[PDB]
Write an enzyme that holds these catalytic residues in place. Sequence first.
Site, short mmCIF file in Angstrom:
data_model
loop_
_atom_site.label_atom_id
_atom_site.label_comp_id
_atom_site.label_asym_id
_atom_site.label_seq_id
_atom_site.Cartn_x
_atom_site.Cartn_y
_atom_site.Cartn_z
N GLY C 24 0.82 -1.24 0.00
CA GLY C 24 0.00 0.00 0.00
C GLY C 24 0.85 1.28 0.00
O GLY C 24 2.06 1.22 0.15
N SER C 25 0.17 2.42 -0.22
CA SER C 25 0.71 3.77 -0.17
C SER C 25 1.86 3.85 0.84
O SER C 25 3.01 4.10 0.48
CB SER C 25 -0.44 4.86 0.02
N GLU C 27 3.73 1.63 2.52
CA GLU C 27 4.78 0.57 2.65
C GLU C 27 5.77 0.59 1.48
O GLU C 27 6.79 -0.12 1.58
CB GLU C 27 4.19 -0.83 2.71
N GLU C 46 -4.82 -9.88 3.35
CA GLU C 46 -3.87 -9.81 4.49
C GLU C 46 -4.01 -11.05 5.37
O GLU C 46 -2.98 -11.49 5.92
CB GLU C 46 -4.13 -8.54 5.29
N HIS C 69 -0.68 -3.20 5.29
CA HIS C 69 -1.05 -1.81 4.89
C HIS C 69 -1.95 -1.14 5.93
O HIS C 69 -3.16 -1.40 5.91
CB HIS C 69 -1.71 -1.78 3.50
N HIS C 280 -14.13 -27.35 24.25
CA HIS C 280 -14.83 -26.68 23.12
C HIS C 280 -16.34 -26.71 23.37
O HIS C 280 -16.87 -25.71 23.89
CB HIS C 280 -14.40 -27.34 21.80
N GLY C 400 -9.09 -22.41 15.99
CA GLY C 400 -10.19 -22.73 15.06
C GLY C 400 -10.62 -21.51 14.27
O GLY C 400 -11.75 -21.52 13.76
C1 LIG Z 1 -13.28 -17.43 10.94
C2 LIG Z 1 -14.34 -18.40 11.36
N1 LIG Z 1 -15.61 -18.07 11.15
C3 LIG Z 1 -16.56 -18.95 11.52
C4 LIG Z 1 -16.27 -20.15 12.12
C5 LIG Z 1 -17.35 -21.13 12.53
N2 LIG Z 1 -17.22 -22.44 11.86
C6 LIG Z 1 -16.53 -23.41 12.41
S1 LIG Z 1 -16.61 -24.86 11.53
C7 LIG Z 1 -17.55 -24.08 10.31
C8 LIG Z 1 -17.98 -24.85 9.09
C9 LIG Z 1 -16.84 -25.18 8.14
O1 LIG Z 1 -17.20 -26.35 7.36
P1 LIG Z 1 -16.16 -27.03 6.35
O2 LIG Z 1 -14.80 -26.40 6.31
O3 LIG Z 1 -16.95 -27.14 5.08
O4 LIG Z 1 -15.99 -28.49 6.98
P2 LIG Z 1 -17.04 -29.59 7.51
O5 LIG Z 1 -17.73 -28.98 8.71
O6 LIG Z 1 -18.04 -29.96 6.44
O7 LIG Z 1 -16.08 -30.71 7.84
C10 LIG Z 1 -17.79 -22.78 10.62
C11 LIG Z 1 -18.53 -21.79 9.77
C12 LIG Z 1 -14.90 -20.40 12.33
N3 LIG Z 1 -14.48 -21.53 12.92
N4 LIG Z 1 -13.94 -19.53 11.94
#
Ligand SMILES: Cc1ncc(C[n+]2csc(CCOP(=O)(O)OP(=O)(O)O)c2C)c(N)n1
Lengths: 527, 531, 527
Positions: C24-25, C27, C46, C69, C280, C400
Amino acid sequence: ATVSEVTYELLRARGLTTVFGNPGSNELPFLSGMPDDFRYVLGLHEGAVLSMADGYSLVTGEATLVNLHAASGSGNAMGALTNSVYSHSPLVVTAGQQVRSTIGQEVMLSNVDAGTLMKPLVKWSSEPTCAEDVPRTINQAIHTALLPAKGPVYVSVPYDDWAAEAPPESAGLLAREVHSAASLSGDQINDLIETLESATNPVLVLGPAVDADRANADAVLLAEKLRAPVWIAPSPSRCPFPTRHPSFRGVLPAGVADLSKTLEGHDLILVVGAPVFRYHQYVPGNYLPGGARLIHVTDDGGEAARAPIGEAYVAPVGSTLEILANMVKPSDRSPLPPLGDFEEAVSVGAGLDPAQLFALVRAGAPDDAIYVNESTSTSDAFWSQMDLSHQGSYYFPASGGLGFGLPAAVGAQLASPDRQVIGLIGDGSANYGITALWSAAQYKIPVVIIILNNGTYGALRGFSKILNTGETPGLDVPGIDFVHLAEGYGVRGTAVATAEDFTTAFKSALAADAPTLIEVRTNFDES
Amino acid sequence: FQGMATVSEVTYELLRARGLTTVFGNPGSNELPFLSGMPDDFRYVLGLHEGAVLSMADGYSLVTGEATLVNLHAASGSGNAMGALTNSVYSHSPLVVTAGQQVRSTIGQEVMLSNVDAGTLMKPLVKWSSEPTCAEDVPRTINQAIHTALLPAKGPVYVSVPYDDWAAEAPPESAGLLAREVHSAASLSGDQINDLIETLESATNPVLVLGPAVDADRANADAVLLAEKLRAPVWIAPSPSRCPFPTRHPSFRGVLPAGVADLSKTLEGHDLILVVGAPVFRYHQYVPGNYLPGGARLIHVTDDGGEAARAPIGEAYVAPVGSTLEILANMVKPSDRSPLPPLGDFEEAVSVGAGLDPAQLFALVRAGAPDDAIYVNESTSTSDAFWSQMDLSHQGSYYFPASGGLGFGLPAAVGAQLASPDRQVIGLIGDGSANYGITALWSAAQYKIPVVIIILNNGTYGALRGFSKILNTGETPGLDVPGIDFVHLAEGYGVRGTAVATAEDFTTAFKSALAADAPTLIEVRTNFDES
Amino acid sequence: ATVSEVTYELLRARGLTTVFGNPGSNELPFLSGMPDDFRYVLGLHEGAVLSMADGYSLVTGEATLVNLHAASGSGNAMGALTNSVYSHSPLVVTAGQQVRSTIGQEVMLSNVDAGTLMKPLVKWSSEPTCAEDVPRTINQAIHTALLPAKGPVYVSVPYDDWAAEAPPESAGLLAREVHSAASLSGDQINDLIETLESATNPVLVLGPAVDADRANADAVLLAEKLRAPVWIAPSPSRCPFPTRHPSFRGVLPAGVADLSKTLEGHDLILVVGAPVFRYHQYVPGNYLPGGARLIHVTDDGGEAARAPIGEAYVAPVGSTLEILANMVKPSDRSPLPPLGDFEEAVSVGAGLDPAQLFALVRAGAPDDAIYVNESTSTSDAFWSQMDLSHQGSYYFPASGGLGFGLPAAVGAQLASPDRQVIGLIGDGSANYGITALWSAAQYKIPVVIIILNNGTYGALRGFSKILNTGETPGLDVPGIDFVHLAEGYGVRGTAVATAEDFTTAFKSALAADAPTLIEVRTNFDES
Ligand SMILES: Cc1ncc(C[n+]2csc(CCOP(=O)(O)OP(=O)(O)O)c2C)c(N)n1
Ligand SMILES: Cc1ncc(C[n+]2csc(CCOP(=O)(O)OP(=O)(O)O)c2C)c(N)n1
Ligand SMILES: Cc1ncc(C[n+]2csc(CCOP(=O)(O)OP(=O)(O)O)c2C)c(N)n1
Ligand code: NA
Ligand code: NA
Ligand code: NA
């Protein structure tokens, strides 16, 4: 079991049976459940409370509990809390908060964003998300405070949480211990000892963490083995070395050019248990003298990262120094000569020169006194004139946050049943923590407080010379009677202007079962 | 050019331009380079402790209405002022707090008296905080700080300046900065008025609840005229920090209790609660129940959008309190109700005990004190006594810490007096409260500030004994503050003090104190109800 | 010498010669002074840039430089940065800032409070107070990133600073090293070894820090000596143990009740290099099984303080495990039997079952493939079906935070010249980091990416069963063609729905010198 019952069972388990406090609406529900084996120490002002807790903590080495009132009470302690950061003091500061359901509406004595208020000072801060989590939050607070690098932590608890049912898994909490690795690789030692036995003319520079880790003797042994001169790192808050040992040379000046000029001629600077470096006055130039390499040993990863030069080892100061002291080979060089006799201390003036006052204190005071110093312009005089050889003999505010000395003295004394604490406070400094005198009176804490009264902010006149600022508003604090202030808070006080009268009042004060204040009239050098 | 000016020269020309010629400070290593360039038309007021400095600044600000400059030392000096700064937030006080910082090149190494993250230190209190990114930007940062402090909703701002910045060359375009003004819309739609006046002339039995912002906006007279037109009773909003209405006007009914159930029970029978210039509401004690009485609608008028958003009930209007009240007062029709009768005579004030009952002490203060005294109150257990017994009738007659942060009263009194050339400030401080700001007595002595300070000494934290009854906490450590002589403390700081325990001796000491050209302290021995 | 010339001499000195960026501008002035021995890796987004940097860092173990940026660029990376915190990844993230004189007026592409923006994630963040302090700020950032507990740091530099003259004391900076104590007291060892040889029926639970410290071998030797079963800590981001070793039992479930029920019968849980625990699903009850004590060994003092049960030792995982492995006595107990054969993997459906796809991947892939997994519903299948035997064989987003997998695969491959990286990404996860495919195409990075496409957010359907939330809006992601997306970014892609076609596409993709993507149609169990 209630959150209060489990919290108290836990504080006892961890040795936090002394509580420093100024109470309020939102802390009565915590204090009401307090057991009989616990002692509460009231201060009239939260800065005093916290500084008393700090002094208590510095003498013991143990974590120490503080209890403050909401945002107004917590805020009043922020200045004092700065000293706790740089003195690596494990204060656990709890604050009362308003009923949990009412905080959002900002009713009276709501702390809005309690986790933000005490940042960036405290290492760690929490308003637990529910009453259930209050005991584990306090457990985590304590372990965190005592984890290298040690430091203050803050926990804001809504007052209704104390009455709530505690979670099932709290027998679990009590059982918890957290240990630090208390050494460093065998490979990494042999590098340190090679570099040390290598050096043709090495110097030790020692910081407060040597005193904190009770390593005064192992520092001594290492200085004897290398026949090495020993300096204290600049802006010292503790005394890590016997001041009359042959190796002792004093305190490095806290200017960049000035420090490097002092260590001119040394090929190895080993700095132990200090930042590199705690400079103050801006005097620019070279960090090191030519042909010098700096080794740096610290508990604090922050200190090692932010240093502008040197090879750092992040390790426990105690262990490291013990290992090095017991394993470096005696060197060829001749054992160092004994120090010159103490310089003579004449006084021409209406009062005492600090140099003479400190020589009178040396002659009168017990071999094992603890000195809590907050006398900003008298540093050269103190070090040239005092005979310290016990661990834990000197405390000075580690970020020059004033209002440490008077309270820390009271707290240090409460922690020290068989050692006399002597406060040496300037007339400026005394006003920041004056109400701690009441605490000494109430709790019958036999401190001696010496006010060095030069009618001025002396160190700031010292600075208006170096900074070419001249005659600035508010350098002078005339018209304060500290005897009147002491008697106002129920402490017996006398004023004194000659060596003979001081020696008398002091001999008397050391005998007393009660707090005593001596106001010495001192002379300020106006050059 | 030879029109070369330093950051110091431009900053001082700007503070003068904006009326900030009075500076409250406790100095240090890092502030001498600022203070050295201070002109002769400026006055520095030293306090021995930063909480006192800042509370003095607060009092000075509350009386004048004007932005006010504070200068503190690094992190240790700024931190000591956080407690005091809470009161400034809830009192909407435009304090501009500057702090010295270490030389700009050395802050990263955290050398001695470095403020590490100066912008973070004073959050979340201050509305706005800056460590300017270079010396050049120091004047505009301070211009922005001042405009921001005075912008609805008013409040404190913090600027940390590295000491080496003052000596740097100022930017070319700085005559521009001086010329700057910022105005706030000082009214609200014509349409939106006719809704307010319909709702007001509608109501069969309306009540005005008034907050500090009525006093701040100098609208006491227009609130009066509006109460006259509606023949409406007037209460002060709970946990008051100012008095927005004459306490002996027919409409005056006192202070609403700061409990939810208690407040709604008090206003039982009213169909319209119009709250002007207060949060809804500044409750304290947790006593749960209904926010409003049955059959009641709450209209809420405030400069503070924060107050309007966070309220748990009501129809709010975010608008200037001054203008709104002026408009409504001059345009509502006289109602079909009888004008309200004069208030009963003040209840009689006997005292049984070794000392004075607060109700009798306040009746003696009423009888002795000028028509136009200013009272700075920090006496937590004596509130019902004060309101049942005082005759306040002028703008700016009452200040109490707006977040109950103790250590406001003594210093704010000194500051209020410095600001108040023609009006006697009387401090009414408890023995507990006085210890948080005791060093402000030195400032009064040094600067010859003729405050009268009355310590109500009941040997205890009385309001905390009050609370250990309501909260069933019982005999708690640290309720008692015995063994303090305030006369010794006063004389310690160079203020003349006397102790007094009877009405005859108090009336004498007080008559004397009001005549004095110097700070005077009266320690009154008072009685705390243990039955 | 300019701030730019010294900064580059320093990054070279420290091995940060690979720079990941989206420019960007603000960097261009940093990038213009970049030398020829340095490589810049552009990413179109990013989050992708930073996740690529993360993968590069995980494979090497080294600190890694990112350049972003202003506020808009730094903000886009906050999600990815969460994974770096929990994966103890030493990312050094520099951001361009607007000209220093104009930040206050908030001109276009001003970062207002740059130090606040990235808190509370990053261990450490600075906007240096002047151009002079930029090199030391970056030195401190690097040392800090590599200090136990390792983690990401952020430095915002106004673009005009790079051109400013560098300070005199800069030869000093280059020379600087910071070492950590790489062991713990001899006393504290004998306690660990007593407790281990004491236990009648002990269990090892291993976390990512074992893999990070290259201690897979020493974990193995210790499991052999105690004939102990080995579990991986819940929510694993790395594989610390050979999955076909006799001791291997799988991954602990990430529920409180479920984990304690699994370890029922063990008297000593030794957890090495994991939090206690990374739960979890909220399935409440007892942290430990009855009659069990938990020993906890971690580089992270934060992990040790916040744990709700256990006796923690804060020490280097590598050293500790090496010491214990070489010094515990072989036990009486019988050497553990060989593992059950891999379970059978038949598939009834329009596509492949994950268990069958992983068995095809096992058979086709090199012994020493590196797997970057971000396939949220397929965990049980992966662990029951894969033969991992080398350090650094498995990476999964450590908080996750989705949008780690695809980019981390690309970065891992760039760092891994002689090992094949295979990405196993769900159809959901792939959308968060899809643009990293462009970077693989541009830099000719021979990654293999397997999209497991089940048309759905599978793991969230799994949760709406446990949470009784039912048919929730937005569980389904139909109508995405990953072959079209691959070709859109210049990567070769094929779609596949049977075992025979997969085995073909995969055999082909492993032969490639270029990024390849296989979209496998998979079946979701709605039971
Ligand atoms: C940045 C982010 N946004 C939302 C979530 C919530 N989330 C966790 S698992 C999931 C579904 C992803 O499914 P996929 O990669 O298709 O695999 P599958 O569940 O079918 O094995 C979501 C939306 C997350 N973990 N991280
Ligand atoms: C809280 C706080 N306020 C202000 C300062 C600035 N300061 C440091 S030295 C000094 C003078 C203190 O005077 P005194 O204690 O009399 O010492 P002397 O210099 O006279 O020996 C002051 C006010 C500070 N360090 N901390
Ligand atoms: C800084 C601060 N600390 C603590 C409190 C809690 N508090 C509320 S009332 C009170 C007692 C002070 O009472 P005093 O001035 O003695 O008046 P009284 O209660 O006797 O009428 C205290 C300490 C507070 N409001 N502010
Ligand atoms: Na002095
Ligand atoms: Na009282
Ligand atoms: Na999916």
